[PDB]
Design a protein that fits this description.
Chains A, B: Catalyzes the reversible conversion of ribose-5-phosphate to ribulose 5-phosphate. Two copies of one chain form a homodimer. Chain A is of the alpha/beta class. The first copy, chain A, contains six helices and 13 strands. The complex binds ribose-5-phosphate (2 copies).
């Protein structure tokens, strides 16, 4: 059987909607990630939306898509707890540590994930790697610190690339910050690197979700969906 | 002899200008803090400004004051290194760990301090405490995370108070964020607490300068200026 990457993303989006229906009680609020795979989950969740109160969203794009389906979106400050957060990843390793932030809303994703009891990572097989780092690591930085943080990254052998828009000017996040996409790191200890980068003044968020990684991953392969589980 | 708090701030500002003239070579760029004590330093530095190229500033207010003295202000991205950063503190303990952020520009102060080789804390005697925490600890937070971070702080017995302007609406920082001023913590291990809070998604900066604390403190007492030194 031949499945394209888009078909594998649909498979895991549907599998995640089933995970929610199987594990999350009626009336719950669902934490919703960002990106192409998450969008497949949103479409699948829409089919069962009547059993849930609504969602907490990790991005402007996700909020727009949820709303296009008539799903209620709650600001996180309104919500005392979340059982589940379903999101994609740019990469995931054997420990369930992830690189995220390749697209929008690095910071928001990490915040929603921090509240949710269970992080369900949905990804096609190409996202599972032996060692994180070949996908550039996003670091959200206060602009005044751009060069200071870049030098710290270069000291580690990292190649920091300021994220730019089509028009060549700096991408700016929702909180008025820049992103350095860092290439050339071979991240054998993601929890340790996460703590080190979080300790640098001027860093807002680092796209290593490792101290709080995936609890499970629904992985869409050419032979079907695999369910991978990880320890806290 | 009787000295007011304002007179003690002037004493340490002047002492810091002498520290700079004694230790920092002609042509250097000086890192400049924020607040009332820092403003005394700015006024004293202005008297010797012809021997220095200019300054890197930690706040809008500081930049305005430097400029009022005809001191050139460089954006930090223009500057490869800084020998010294002179700034106040809301509190400083025996290890030279500080609480800062009580006034403006928590994040900027911490960034400039991170680049400077030597942090000179200027403070009157009332700032030296046995244990940090009676001055509320500022935590800069992404607004979506306000309640999530507040709950983590309450778990520690902290009383998180959203910072408000005179008009009662939330103070917003330069990076579009809120500040929680946290009361009731008794911070016996500031480096550990700093790392814990820096590890929470939604935290931008925490006003514990502990992993990188003061290298020395010029402390203005009723018996004169004391010079205190601390280890990295
Ligand atoms: O910043 C975007 C998110 O972290 C996404 O979850 C990640 O980039 C994966 O997106 P996709 O499923 O489109 O590969
Ligand atoms: O956010 C303001 C700074 O951290 C100051 O350095 C601190 O608040 C001390 O200011 P002051 O010298 O006015 O007491």
């Amino acid at each position: 059987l031949l499945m394209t990457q888009d078909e594998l993303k649909r498979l895991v989006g549907e599998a995640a909607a089933r995970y929610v229906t199987d594990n999350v009680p009626q009336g719950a609020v669902i934490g919703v990630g960002t990106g192409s795979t998450a969008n497949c989950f949103i479409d699948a969740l829409a089919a069962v939306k009547d059993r849930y109160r609504g969602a907490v969203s990790s991005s402007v794009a996700t909020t727009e898509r949820l709303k296009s389906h008539g799903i209620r979106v709650f600001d996180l400050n309104e919500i005392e707890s979340l059982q589940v957060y379903v999101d994609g990843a740019d990469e995931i390793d054997e420990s369930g540590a992830m690189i995220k932030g390749g697209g929008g809303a690095l910071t928001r994703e990490k915040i929603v994930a921090s509240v949710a009891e269970t992080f369900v990572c949905i990804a096609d097989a190409s996202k599972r790697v032996a060692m994180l780092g070949q996908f550039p690591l996003p670091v959200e930085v206060v602009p005044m610190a751009r060069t200071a943080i870049g030098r710290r990254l270069a000291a580690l052998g990292g190649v920091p690339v300021l994220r730019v828009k089509q028009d060549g000017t700096p991408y700016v996040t929702d909180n008025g910050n820049e992103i350095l996409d860092v290439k050339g790191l071979r991240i054998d200890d993601p929890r340790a690197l996460e703590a080190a980068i979080n300790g640098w003044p001027g860093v807002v968020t680092v796209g290593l979700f490792a101290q709080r990684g995936a609890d499970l991953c629904l992985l869409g392969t050419e032979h079907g969906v695999e369910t991978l589980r990880y320890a806290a």
